[PDB]
Amino acid sequence: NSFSGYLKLTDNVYIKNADIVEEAKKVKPTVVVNAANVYLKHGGGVAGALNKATNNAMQVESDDYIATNGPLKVGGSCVLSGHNLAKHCLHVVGPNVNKGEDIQLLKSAYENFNQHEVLLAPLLSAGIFGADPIHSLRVCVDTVRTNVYLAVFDKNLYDKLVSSFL
Numbered sequence: 001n002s003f004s005g006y007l008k009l010t011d012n013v014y015i016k017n018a019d020i021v022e023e024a025k026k027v028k029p030t031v032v033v034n035a036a037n038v039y040l041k042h043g044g045g046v047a048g049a050l051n052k053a054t055n056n057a058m059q060v061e062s063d064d065y066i067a068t069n070g071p072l073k074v075g076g077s078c079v080l081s082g083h084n085l086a087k088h089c090l091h092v093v094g095p096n097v098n099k100g101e102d103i104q105l106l107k108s109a110y111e112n113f114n115q116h117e118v119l120l121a122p123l124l125s126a127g128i129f130g131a132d133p134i135h136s137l138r139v140c141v142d143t144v145r146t147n148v149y150l151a152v153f154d155k156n157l158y159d160k161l162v163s164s165f166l
């Protein structure tokens with residue numbers, strides 16, 4: 001495939017220091033994962049950045065989804081359009097530790113990835129969602145069985161994740 005410069009961690013997990021928006025724009029993958037919240041309010045982090053790159057079309061689509069279906073569950077997901085970034089966007093809600101949500105729900109969140117053969121994704125629950133990215137990577141490796149290409153925004157963190165992996 002067109003994913004370039006990823007370090008192989010396991011049979012099915014690959015990692016790169018990259019902005020997921022730029023990776024999506026260049027590769028145009030079948031599935032890009034959004035680090036969503038239950039309301040699909042794409043304000044910041046991965047979600048705000050993906051939505052900005054769609055010129056707010058992701059938010060417009062998401063507001064119609066919520067008006068029809070109500071909020072997602074923490075640990076849940078929905079498939080919506082990938083707009084100009086991907087064929088599909090898989091919106092996945094990891095627990096927000098800053099809100100006291102159960103970190104055990106991170107495994108449930110990653111299980112959604114197993115419904116898709118290949119994904120471009122961030123580390124769920126990390127960044128502004130408050131969880132330890134080292135833990136998020138371990139849960140990913142131990143939960144996802146399909147092929148996942150992880151884009152880590154921060155270089156300092158990327159290097160720490162690689163160095164501490166084996």
Ligand SMILES: O=S1(=O)CCC[C@@](O)(CNc2ncnc3[nH]ccc23)C1
Binds near residue numbers: 122123153157
């Ligand atoms: O500070 S972090 O590296 C800690 C680990 C999770 C993060 O990677 C999640 N946020 C992003 N990841 C990838 N591309 C992105 N574009 C815009 C935001 C963004 C941020």
Ligand SMILES: [Cl-]
Binds near residue numbers: 044046126127128
């Ligand atoms: Cl973030």
